[PDB]
Amino acid sequence: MPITSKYTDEQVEKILAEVALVLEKHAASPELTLMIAGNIATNVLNQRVAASQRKLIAEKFAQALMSSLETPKTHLEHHHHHH
Amino acid sequence: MPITSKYTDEQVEKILAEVALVLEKHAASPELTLMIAGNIATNVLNQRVAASQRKLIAEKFAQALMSSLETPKTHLEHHHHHH
């Protein structure tokens, strides 16, 4: 789903890994971690994203985040080839 | 806003510097940058946050992001002019 710019998938994973490494590198708490993500998006919306895209991409973000909000509620899925 | 943080800004800022450094390091584009933040929040909402605390903390994050979304809010004028 190309709702976001098609960057290299493995690249995204590698970037996430290094970011998570920095979190571990400073023993970042869940709150601190999630607030750090907030700071990231904030800087995007401040000095990086388009003004016109700003509310749309933020809504897209929130909607995606809501649809990525999961729990151990999965019952009879197709395959556990997912993390 | 002093919510969610409570942590030393010295600590937070230096972590942010290293986190953003990884993004600059890999020449992360705006959408990639913000999608990285999304994956971060998602991971937190999966493994780090509590189930009961999940939706609240997610809303908390979104609302904090909306308020950190700094578009031109209410340009002060003294004419009550129409256009």
Side-chain angles (χ1 to χ4, degrees):
Chain A
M1 296 300 184
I3 59 174
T4 316
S5 298
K6 64 287 295 183
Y7 309 101
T8 313
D9 59 335
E10 184 183 79
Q11 179 186 211
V12 178
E13 176 232 293
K14 295 301 177 293
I15 299 176
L16 289 173
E18 291 189 76
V19 175
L21 188 152
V22 179
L23 303 178
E24 176 62 75
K25 186 172 178 288
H26 284 267
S29 61
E31 282 277 82
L32 180 60
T33 296
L34 188 140
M35 177 173 49
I36 284 178
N39 276 272
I40 298 180
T42 301
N43 278 272
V44 183
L45 302 176
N46 270 268
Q47 300 179 150
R48 174 158 300 199
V49 81
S52 312
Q53 197 56 269
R54 189 142 45 185
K55 275 303 188 72
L56 200 173
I57 198 171
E59 178 178 84
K60 187 174 72 174
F61 172 76
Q63 244 61 211
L65 192 57
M66 292 303 89
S67 44
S68 305
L69 196 164
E70 268 306 324
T71 37
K73 66 173 185 295
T74 180
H75 291 112
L76 295 179
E77 60 288 90
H78 190 90
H79 266 148
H80 269 272
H81 192 238
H82 178 267
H83 293 269
Chain B
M1 55 185 61
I3 50 84
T4 303
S5 44
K6 177 180 171 295
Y7 308 120
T8 309
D9 65 89
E10 159 61 48
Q11 170 177 147
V12 180
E13 191 185 294
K14 299 300 169 59
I15 305 175
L16 295 176
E18 287 179 78
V19 174
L21 188 152
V22 179
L23 302 181
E24 181 179 73
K25 233 282 200 177
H26 284 254
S29 311
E31 285 207 290
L32 182 57
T33 301
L34 192 142
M35 183 166 55
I36 293 304
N39 278 269
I40 297 177
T42 303
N43 182 29
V44 180
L45 294 178
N46 280 214
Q47 302 184 90
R48 292 193 172 229
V49 77
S52 306
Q53 203 65 90
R54 200 153 300 182
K55 180 53 173 168
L56 205 178
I57 254 178
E59 296 297 278
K60 184 189 69 164
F61 175 65
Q63 292 297 90
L65 189 60
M66 295 296 85
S67 43
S68 302
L69 195 163
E70 191 141 272
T71 41
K73 298 185 182 65
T74 333
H75 191 100
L76 297 74
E77 68 92 79
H78 203 129
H79 293 249
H80 64 264
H81 74 282
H82 298 131
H83 193 100

Coordinates of all heavy atoms in Angstrom, one line a residue, chain A residues 3-5 7 11-12 15-16 18-19 22-23 25-26 28-42 44-46 48 54-55 57-58 60-61 65-66 68-72, chain B residues 3-5 7 11-12 15-16 18-19 22-23 26 28-42 44-46 48 54-55 57-61 65-66 68-72:
Chain A
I3 N 0.6 4.3 0.4 CA 0.0 5.5 1.0 C 1.2 6.4 1.5 O 1.0 7.6 1.7 CB -0.9 5.2 2.2 CG1 -0.2 4.4 3.3 CG2 -2.1 4.4 1.7 CD1 -1.0 4.1 4.5
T4 N 2.3 5.8 1.8 CA 3.5 6.6 2.1 C 4.5 6.4 1.0 O 4.5 5.4 0.3 CB 4.1 6.1 3.5 OG1 3.0 5.9 4.4 CG2 5.1 7.0 4.0
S5 N 5.4 7.3 0.8 CA 6.5 7.2 -0.2 C 7.2 5.9 -0.1 O 7.6 5.4 1.0 CB 7.5 8.4 0.0 OG 6.9 9.6 -0.2
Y7 N 9.9 3.9 0.2 CA 11.3 3.8 0.6 C 11.6 2.3 0.7 O 10.7 1.4 0.7 CB 11.6 4.4 2.0 CG 11.1 5.8 2.1 CD1 9.9 6.1 2.8 CD2 11.8 6.9 1.6 CE1 9.4 7.4 2.9 CE2 11.3 8.2 1.7 CZ 10.2 8.4 2.4 OH 9.7 9.7 2.5
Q11 N 15.5 -1.0 4.5 CA 16.1 0.2 4.9 C 15.3 0.8 6.1 O 15.9 1.2 7.1 CB 16.1 1.3 3.8 CG 16.7 2.6 4.2 CD 16.6 3.6 3.1 OE1 17.5 4.5 3.0 NE2 15.6 3.6 2.3
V12 N 14.0 0.8 6.0 CA 13.2 1.3 7.1 C 13.4 0.5 8.4 O 13.6 1.0 9.4 CB 11.7 1.2 6.7 CG1 10.8 1.7 7.9 CG2 11.4 2.0 5.5
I15 N 16.8 1.4 9.9 CA 16.7 2.7 10.5 C 16.0 2.6 11.9 O 16.5 3.1 12.9 CB 15.9 3.7 9.7 CG1 16.6 4.0 8.3 CG2 15.8 5.1 10.4 CD1 15.9 4.9 7.4
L16 N 14.9 1.8 11.9 CA 14.2 1.6 13.1 C 15.1 0.9 14.2 O 15.1 1.2 15.3 CB 12.9 0.7 12.9 CG 11.8 1.4 12.1 CD1 10.7 0.4 11.8 CD2 11.2 2.5 13.0
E18 N 18.4 1.0 14.4 CA 19.4 1.9 15.0 C 18.7 2.9 15.9 O 19.3 3.3 17.0 CB 20.1 2.7 13.9 CG 21.0 1.8 13.1 CD 21.9 2.5 12.1 OE1 22.9 3.2 12.6 OE2 21.6 2.5 10.9
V19 N 17.5 3.3 15.6 CA 16.7 4.2 16.5 C 16.4 3.5 17.8 O 16.6 4.1 18.9 CB 15.4 4.7 15.9 CG1 14.6 5.5 16.8 CG2 15.7 5.5 14.6
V22 N 19.4 3.4 20.0 CA 19.6 4.7 20.7 C 18.7 4.7 22.0 O 19.2 5.2 23.0 CB 19.4 5.9 19.8 CG1 19.6 7.2 20.6 CG2 20.3 5.9 18.6
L23 N 17.5 4.2 21.8 CA 16.6 4.2 23.0 C 17.2 3.3 24.1 O 17.2 3.7 25.2 CB 15.3 3.6 22.5 CG 14.6 4.4 21.4 CD1 13.3 3.7 21.0 CD2 14.3 5.8 21.8
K25 N 20.3 2.5 24.3 CA 21.6 3.2 24.6 C 21.4 4.2 25.8 O 22.4 4.6 26.4 CB 22.1 3.9 23.4 CG 23.5 4.5 23.5 CD 24.0 5.0 22.1 CE 25.4 5.7 22.3 NZ 25.3 7.0 22.9
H26 N 20.2 4.7 26.0 CA 19.9 5.6 27.0 C 18.8 5.1 28.0 O 18.3 5.9 28.8 CB 19.5 7.0 26.5 CG 20.7 7.8 25.9 ND1 21.3 8.7 26.7 CD2 21.2 7.8 24.7 CE1 22.3 9.3 25.9 NE2 22.2 8.8 24.7
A28 N 15.7 4.3 27.5 CA 14.5 5.2 27.4 C 13.3 4.4 27.8 O 13.0 3.3 27.3 CB 14.4 5.6 25.9
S29 N 12.5 5.0 28.7 CA 11.2 4.4 29.2 C 10.2 4.5 28.0 O 10.4 5.2 27.0 CB 10.7 5.3 30.4 OG 10.5 6.6 30.0
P30 N 9.1 3.7 28.2 CA 8.0 3.7 27.2 C 7.5 5.1 26.9 O 7.3 5.5 25.8 CB 6.9 2.9 27.9 CG 7.3 2.7 29.3 CD 8.8 2.8 29.3
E31 N 7.2 5.9 28.0 CA 6.8 7.3 27.9 C 7.8 8.1 27.1 O 7.4 8.8 26.2 CB 6.5 7.8 29.3 CG 5.2 7.4 29.9 CD 4.0 8.2 29.4 OE1 3.5 7.9 28.3 OE2 3.6 9.1 30.1
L32 N 9.0 8.1 27.6 CA 10.1 8.8 27.0 C 10.2 8.4 25.5 O 10.3 9.3 24.6 CB 11.4 8.6 27.7 CG 12.7 9.3 27.1 CD1 12.4 10.8 27.2 CD2 13.9 8.9 27.9
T33 N 10.2 7.1 25.2 CA 10.3 6.6 23.9 C 9.2 7.2 23.0 O 9.4 7.7 21.9 CB 10.2 5.1 23.9 OG1 11.3 4.5 24.6 CG2 10.1 4.5 22.5
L34 N 8.0 7.1 23.5 CA 6.8 7.5 22.7 C 6.8 9.0 22.5 O 6.4 9.5 21.5 CB 5.5 7.0 23.4 CG 4.2 7.2 22.6 CD1 3.3 5.9 22.7 CD2 3.5 8.4 23.0
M35 N 7.2 9.7 23.6 CA 7.3 11.1 23.5 C 8.4 11.6 22.5 O 8.3 12.6 21.9 CB 7.6 11.7 24.9 CG 7.8 13.2 25.0 SD 8.0 13.8 26.6 CE 9.2 12.7 27.3
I36 N 9.5 10.8 22.4 CA 10.5 11.0 21.5 C 10.0 10.9 20.0 O 10.3 11.7 19.2 CB 11.7 10.0 21.6 CG1 12.6 10.4 22.8 CG2 12.6 9.9 20.4 CD1 13.7 9.4 23.1
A37 N 9.1 9.9 19.8 CA 8.4 9.8 18.5 C 7.6 11.0 18.3 O 7.5 11.5 17.1 CB 7.6 8.5 18.5
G38 N 7.0 11.5 19.3 CA 6.2 12.7 19.2 C 7.1 13.9 18.8 O 6.7 14.7 17.9
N39 N 8.2 14.0 19.4 CA 9.2 15.1 19.1 C 9.6 15.0 17.6 O 9.8 16.0 16.9 CB 10.4 15.0 20.0 CG 10.3 15.7 21.3 OD1 10.5 16.9 21.4 ND2 9.8 15.0 22.3
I40 N 9.8 13.8 17.1 CA 10.1 13.5 15.7 C 9.1 14.1 14.8 O 9.3 15.0 14.0 CB 10.3 12.0 15.5 CG1 11.5 11.4 16.3 CG2 10.6 11.8 14.0 CD1 11.7 10.0 16.0
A41 N 7.8 13.6 15.0 CA 6.7 14.1 14.2 C 6.5 15.6 14.3 O 6.2 16.3 13.3 CB 5.4 13.3 14.6
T42 N 6.7 16.1 15.5 CA 6.6 17.5 15.8 C 7.6 18.3 14.9 O 7.2 19.3 14.2 CB 6.9 17.9 17.2 OG1 6.0 17.2 18.1 CG2 6.8 19.4 17.5
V44 N 8.9 17.3 12.2 CA 8.4 17.1 10.8 C 7.4 18.1 10.5 O 7.5 18.9 9.5 CB 7.8 15.7 10.6 CG1 7.4 15.5 9.1 CG2 8.8 14.6 11.0
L45 N 6.4 18.2 11.3 CA 5.3 19.2 11.1 C 5.7 20.6 11.3 O 5.0 21.5 10.9 CB 4.1 18.9 12.1 CG 3.6 17.4 12.0 CD1 2.5 17.2 13.1 CD2 3.0 17.1 10.7
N46 N 6.9 20.8 11.8 CA 7.4 22.2 12.0 C 8.3 22.7 11.0 O 8.3 23.9 10.6 CB 8.0 22.3 13.4 CG 7.0 22.7 14.5 OD1 6.8 23.9 14.8 ND2 6.4 21.7 15.1
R48 N 9.7 20.6 8.1 CA 10.0 19.5 7.2 C 8.8 19.2 6.3 O 9.0 19.0 5.1 CB 10.4 18.3 8.1 CG 10.6 17.0 7.3 CD 11.5 16.1 8.1 NE 12.8 16.6 8.3 CZ 13.9 15.9 8.6 NH1 13.8 14.6 8.7 NH2 15.1 16.5 8.8
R54 N 0.2 19.1 6.0 CA 0.4 19.0 7.5 C -0.8 18.3 8.2 O -0.6 17.3 8.9 CB 0.7 20.3 8.0 CG 1.1 20.4 9.5 CD 2.2 21.4 9.7 NE 1.9 22.7 9.0 CZ 2.7 23.8 9.0 NH1 3.9 23.7 9.5 NH2 2.3 24.9 8.4
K55 N -2.0 18.8 8.0 CA -3.2 18.2 8.7 C -3.6 16.9 8.1 O -4.0 16.0 8.8 CB -4.3 19.2 8.7 CG -4.3 20.2 9.8 CD -4.3 19.6 11.2 CE -4.4 20.6 12.3 NZ -5.8 21.1 12.4
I57 N -1.5 14.6 6.5 CA -0.5 13.6 6.8 C -0.6 13.3 8.3 O -0.3 12.1 8.7 CB 0.9 14.0 6.4 CG1 1.9 12.9 6.4 CG2 1.4 15.1 7.4 CD1 3.2 13.2 5.8
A58 N -1.0 14.2 9.1 CA -1.2 14.0 10.6 C -2.4 13.1 10.8 O -2.3 12.2 11.7 CB -1.3 15.3 11.3
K60 N -3.6 11.1 8.6 CA -3.2 9.8 8.0 C -2.3 9.1 9.0 O -2.5 7.9 9.2 CB -2.3 10.1 6.7 CG -2.0 8.8 6.0 CD -1.3 9.1 4.7 CE 0.2 9.6 4.8 NZ 0.9 9.8 3.5
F61 N -1.5 9.8 9.7 CA -0.6 9.2 10.8 C -1.5 8.7 11.9 O -1.4 7.5 12.3 CB 0.3 10.3 11.3 CG 1.1 9.9 12.5 CD1 2.1 9.0 12.4 CD2 0.7 10.4 13.8 CE1 2.8 8.6 13.6 CE2 1.4 10.0 14.9 CZ 2.5 9.1 14.8
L65 N -1.9 4.9 13.0 CA -1.6 4.6 14.3 C -2.7 3.9 15.1 O -2.5 2.9 15.8 CB -1.1 5.8 15.1 CG -0.4 5.5 16.5 CD1 0.8 4.7 16.2 CD2 0.0 6.8 17.1
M66 N -3.9 4.3 14.8 CA -5.1 3.7 15.4 C -5.3 2.3 14.8 O -5.7 1.3 15.6 CB -6.4 4.5 15.1 CG -6.4 5.8 15.9 SD -6.2 5.7 17.6 CE -4.5 5.8 17.8
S68 N -2.9 0.5 13.8 CA -1.8 -0.3 14.2 C -1.8 -0.6 15.7 O -0.9 -1.2 16.2 CB -0.5 0.4 13.8 OG -0.4 0.8 12.4
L69 N -2.8 0.0 16.3 CA -3.0 -0.2 17.7 C -3.6 -1.6 17.9 O -4.8 -1.9 17.7 CB -3.9 0.8 18.3 CG -4.0 1.0 19.9 CD1 -4.6 2.3 20.2 CD2 -4.7 -0.2 20.5
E70 N -2.7 -2.6 18.3 CA -3.2 -4.0 18.4 C -3.1 -4.5 19.8 O -2.6 -3.8 20.7 CB -2.3 -4.9 17.5 CG -2.9 -5.0 16.1 CD -4.3 -5.6 16.2 OE1 -4.7 -6.4 17.1 OE2 -5.2 -5.1 15.3
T71 N -3.6 -5.7 20.0 CA -3.7 -6.4 21.3 C -3.7 -7.9 21.0 O -3.8 -8.3 19.8 CB -5.0 -6.0 22.0 OG1 -6.1 -5.8 21.1 CG2 -4.8 -4.7 22.8
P72 N -3.5 -8.7 22.0 CA -3.5 -10.2 21.9 C -4.9 -10.7 21.6 O -5.3 -11.7 22.2 CB -3.0 -10.7 23.2 CG -2.4 -9.5 23.9 CD -3.1 -8.3 23.4
Chain B
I3 N 3.5 17.5 30.4 CA 2.9 16.2 30.6 C 3.7 15.2 29.9 O 4.4 15.4 28.9 CB 1.4 16.2 30.2 CG1 1.3 16.8 28.8 CG2 0.6 17.0 31.2 CD1 1.5 15.8 27.7
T4 N 3.7 13.9 30.4 CA 4.4 12.8 29.9 C 5.9 12.8 30.1 O 6.5 11.8 30.2 CB 4.1 12.6 28.3 OG1 2.6 12.5 28.2 CG2 4.7 11.4 27.7
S5 N 6.4 14.0 30.1 CA 7.9 14.2 30.3 C 8.3 14.0 31.7 O 8.5 12.9 32.1 CB 8.3 15.6 29.7 OG 7.4 16.6 30.2
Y7 N 11.0 14.2 32.8 CA 12.4 13.8 32.7 C 13.3 15.0 32.5 O 12.8 16.1 32.0 CB 12.6 12.8 31.6 CG 11.6 11.6 31.6 CD1 10.8 11.3 30.6 CD2 11.6 10.7 32.7 CE1 9.9 10.2 30.6 CE2 10.7 9.6 32.8 CZ 9.9 9.4 31.7 OH 9.0 8.3 31.7
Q11 N 18.8 15.2 29.3 CA 18.7 13.8 28.9 C 17.9 13.7 27.6 O 18.4 13.1 26.7 CB 18.1 13.0 30.1 CG 17.8 11.6 29.7 CD 17.2 10.7 30.8 OE1 16.4 9.9 30.6 NE2 17.7 11.0 32.0
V12 N 16.7 14.2 27.6 CA 15.8 14.0 26.5 C 16.4 14.6 25.2 O 16.4 14.0 24.2 CB 14.4 14.7 26.8 CG1 13.5 14.5 25.6 CG2 13.8 14.1 28.0
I15 N 19.2 12.6 23.7 CA 18.7 11.4 23.1 C 18.0 11.7 21.8 O 18.3 11.1 20.8 CB 17.6 10.7 24.0 CG1 18.2 10.4 25.4 CG2 17.2 9.4 23.3 CD1 17.2 9.8 26.4
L16 N 17.2 12.8 21.8 CA 16.6 13.3 20.5 C 17.7 13.6 19.5 O 17.5 13.3 18.3 CB 15.8 14.6 20.8 CG 14.6 14.4 21.7 CD1 13.9 15.7 22.0 CD2 13.6 13.4 21.1
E18 N 20.6 12.2 19.1 CA 21.1 11.0 18.6 C 20.1 10.3 17.7 O 20.4 9.7 16.7 CB 21.6 10.0 19.7 CG 22.9 10.5 20.3 CD 23.4 9.6 21.4 OE1 23.9 8.5 21.1 OE2 23.2 9.9 22.6
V19 N 18.8 10.3 18.1 CA 17.7 9.7 17.3 C 17.6 10.4 16.0 O 17.5 9.8 14.9 CB 16.4 9.8 18.1 CG1 15.2 9.3 17.2 CG2 16.5 9.0 19.4
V22 N 20.3 9.6 13.5 CA 20.2 8.4 12.7 C 19.3 8.7 11.5 O 19.6 8.1 10.4 CB 19.5 7.3 13.6 CG1 19.3 6.0 12.7 CG2 20.3 7.0 14.8
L23 N 18.4 9.5 11.6 CA 17.5 9.9 10.5 C 18.3 10.7 9.5 O 18.2 10.5 8.3 CB 16.3 10.7 11.0 CG 15.4 9.9 12.0 CD1 14.2 10.7 12.4 CD2 15.0 8.6 11.5
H26 N 20.8 8.6 7.6 CA 20.3 7.8 6.5 C 19.5 8.7 5.5 O 18.8 8.1 4.6 CB 19.4 6.7 7.0 CG 20.2 5.5 7.6 ND1 20.3 4.3 7.0 CD2 20.8 5.4 8.8 CE1 21.0 3.5 7.7 NE2 21.3 4.1 8.9
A28 N 16.8 10.5 5.9 CA 15.4 10.2 6.0 C 14.6 11.3 5.5 O 14.7 12.5 6.0 CB 15.1 9.8 7.4
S29 N 13.7 11.1 4.5 CA 12.8 12.0 4.0 C 11.6 12.3 4.9 O 11.4 11.5 5.9 CB 12.3 11.6 2.6 OG 13.4 11.1 1.8
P30 N 10.9 13.4 4.8 CA 9.8 13.7 5.7 C 8.8 12.5 6.1 O 8.6 12.2 7.2 CB 9.0 14.8 5.0 CG 9.6 14.9 3.6 CD 11.0 14.4 3.7
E31 N 8.3 11.9 5.0 CA 7.3 10.8 5.3 C 8.0 9.6 6.0 O 7.5 9.1 6.9 CB 6.7 10.3 4.0 CG 5.6 11.2 3.5 CD 4.6 10.5 2.6 OE1 4.9 10.0 1.5 OE2 3.4 10.3 3.1
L32 N 9.2 9.3 5.6 CA 10.0 8.3 6.3 C 10.2 8.7 7.7 O 10.0 7.8 8.6 CB 11.4 8.1 5.6 CG 12.3 7.0 6.1 CD1 11.6 5.7 6.1 CD2 13.6 6.9 5.3
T33 N 10.6 9.9 7.9 CA 10.9 10.4 9.3 C 9.6 10.2 10.2 O 9.8 9.7 11.3 CB 11.2 11.9 9.2 OG1 12.3 12.2 8.4 CG2 11.4 12.5 10.6
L34 N 8.5 10.6 9.7 CA 7.3 10.6 10.5 C 6.8 9.2 10.6 O 6.2 8.8 11.6 CB 6.2 11.5 9.8 CG 5.0 11.8 10.7 CD1 4.6 13.3 10.5 CD2 3.9 10.9 10.3
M35 N 7.0 8.4 9.5 CA 6.6 7.0 9.6 C 7.5 6.2 10.5 O 7.0 5.2 11.1 CB 6.6 6.4 8.2 CG 6.2 4.9 8.1 SD 5.8 4.4 6.4 CE 7.4 4.7 5.6
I36 N 8.7 6.6 10.7 CA 9.6 6.0 11.7 C 9.0 6.3 13.1 O 8.9 5.4 13.9 CB 11.0 6.6 11.7 CG1 11.8 6.2 10.4 CG2 11.8 6.2 12.9 CD1 11.8 4.7 10.2
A37 N 8.5 7.5 13.3 CA 7.9 7.9 14.6 C 6.6 7.0 14.8 O 6.3 6.6 15.9 CB 7.5 9.4 14.6
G38 N 5.9 6.8 13.7 CA 4.7 6.0 13.8 C 5.0 4.6 14.2 O 4.3 4.0 15.1
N39 N 6.0 4.0 13.6 CA 6.5 2.6 14.0 C 6.9 2.6 15.4 O 6.7 1.6 16.1 CB 7.6 2.2 13.1 CG 7.1 1.6 11.7 OD1 6.9 0.4 11.6 ND2 6.9 2.4 10.7
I40 N 7.6 3.6 15.9 CA 8.0 3.8 17.3 C 6.8 3.7 18.2 O 6.7 2.9 19.1 CB 8.8 5.1 17.5 CG1 10.1 5.1 16.7 CG2 9.1 5.2 19.0 CD1 10.9 6.4 16.9
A41 N 5.8 4.6 17.9 CA 4.6 4.6 18.8 C 3.9 3.3 18.7 O 3.4 2.9 19.7 CB 3.7 5.8 18.3
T42 N 3.8 2.7 17.5 CA 3.2 1.4 17.3 C 3.8 0.4 18.2 O 3.1 -0.3 18.9 CB 3.2 1.0 15.8 OG1 2.6 2.0 15.0 CG2 2.5 -0.3 15.6
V44 N 5.6 0.8 20.9 CA 5.3 1.1 22.2 C 3.9 0.7 22.6 O 3.6 0.1 23.6 CB 5.4 2.6 22.5 CG1 5.1 3.0 24.0 CG2 6.8 3.1 22.2
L45 N 2.9 1.0 21.7 CA 1.5 0.6 21.9 C 1.3 -0.9 21.8 O 0.3 -1.4 22.2 CB 0.6 1.3 20.8 CG 0.5 2.8 20.9 CD1 -0.3 3.4 19.8 CD2 0.0 3.2 22.3
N46 N 2.3 -1.6 21.4 CA 2.2 -3.1 21.3 C 2.9 -3.8 22.5 O 2.2 -4.5 23.2 CB 2.9 -3.6 20.0 CG 2.0 -3.5 18.8 OD1 2.0 -4.4 17.9 ND2 1.2 -2.5 18.7
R48 N 5.2 -2.1 24.9 CA 5.6 -1.3 26.0 C 4.5 -0.7 26.9 O 4.6 -0.7 28.1 CB 6.5 -0.1 25.5 CG 7.8 -0.5 25.0 CD 8.8 0.7 24.8 NE 10.1 0.2 24.4 CZ 11.2 0.7 25.0 NH1 11.1 1.5 26.0 NH2 12.4 0.3 24.5
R54 N -3.6 1.9 26.9 CA -3.2 2.0 25.5 C -4.0 3.1 24.7 O -3.3 4.0 24.2 CB -3.5 0.6 24.9 CG -2.7 0.4 23.6 CD -2.5 -1.1 23.4 NE -1.7 -1.7 24.5 CZ -1.3 -3.0 24.6 NH1 -1.6 -3.8 23.6 NH2 -0.6 -3.4 25.6
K55 N -5.3 3.0 24.7 CA -6.1 3.9 24.0 C -5.9 5.3 24.5 O -5.9 6.3 23.8 CB -7.6 3.5 24.0 CG -8.5 4.4 23.2 CD -8.0 4.7 21.8 CE -9.0 5.5 21.0 NZ -8.5 6.0 19.7
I57 N -3.3 6.6 26.2 CA -1.9 7.0 25.9 C -1.8 7.4 24.4 O -1.0 8.3 24.0 CB -0.9 6.0 26.4 CG1 -0.1 6.6 27.6 CG2 0.2 5.7 25.3 CD1 0.9 5.6 28.2
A58 N -2.5 6.6 23.6 CA -2.5 6.9 22.1 C -3.2 8.2 21.8 O -2.7 9.0 21.1 CB -3.2 5.7 21.4
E59 N -4.4 8.4 22.5 CA -5.1 9.7 22.3 C -4.3 10.8 22.9 O -4.2 11.9 22.3 CB -6.5 9.6 23.1 CG -7.4 8.6 22.5 CD -7.8 8.9 21.1 OE1 -8.7 9.8 20.9 OE2 -7.3 8.3 20.2
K60 N -3.7 10.6 24.0 CA -2.8 11.6 24.7 C -1.7 12.0 23.7 O -1.4 13.2 23.5 CB -2.1 10.9 25.9 CG -1.2 11.9 26.7 CD -0.5 11.2 27.8 CE 0.6 10.2 27.2 NZ 1.6 9.8 28.3
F61 N -1.1 11.0 23.0 CA 0.0 11.2 22.0 C -0.6 12.1 20.9 O 0.1 13.1 20.5 CB 0.5 9.9 21.5 CG 1.5 10.0 20.4 CD1 2.7 10.7 20.7 CD2 1.3 9.5 19.2 CE1 3.7 10.8 19.7 CE2 2.2 9.7 18.2 CZ 3.4 10.3 18.4
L65 N 0.3 15.8 19.9 CA 0.9 16.1 18.5 C 0.1 17.2 17.8 O 0.7 18.0 17.1 CB 0.9 14.8 17.7 CG 1.7 14.8 16.4 CD1 3.1 15.2 16.7 CD2 1.5 13.5 15.7
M66 N -1.2 17.2 18.0 CA -2.0 18.2 17.3 C -1.7 19.6 17.9 O -1.7 20.6 17.1 CB -3.5 17.9 17.6 CG -4.0 16.6 17.0 SD -4.0 16.6 15.1 CE -2.3 16.0 14.9
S68 N 1.2 20.4 19.2 CA 2.6 20.7 18.8 C 2.6 21.0 17.3 O 3.7 21.5 16.8 CB 3.5 19.5 19.2 OG 3.4 19.2 20.6
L69 N 1.6 20.6 16.6 CA 1.4 21.0 15.2 C 1.2 22.5 15.1 O 0.1 23.0 15.3 CB 0.2 20.2 14.6 CG 0.1 20.2 13.1 CD1 -0.8 19.1 12.6 CD2 -0.3 21.5 12.5
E70 N 2.3 23.2 14.9 CA 2.2 24.7 14.9 C 2.0 25.3 13.6 O 2.9 25.7 12.9 CB 3.5 25.2 15.6 CG 3.4 26.7 16.0 CD 4.0 27.0 17.3 OE1 3.3 26.9 18.3 OE2 5.2 27.4 17.3
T71 N 0.7 25.4 13.2 CA 0.2 26.2 12.1 C -0.1 27.6 12.7 O -0.2 27.8 13.9 CB -1.0 25.6 11.5 OG1 -1.9 25.1 12.5 CG2 -0.6 24.5 10.5
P72 N -0.1 28.7 11.8 CA -0.5 30.0 12.2 C -1.9 30.1 12.9 O -2.9 29.9 12.3 CB -0.6 30.8 10.9 CG -0.6 29.8 9.8 CD 0.1 28.6 10.4

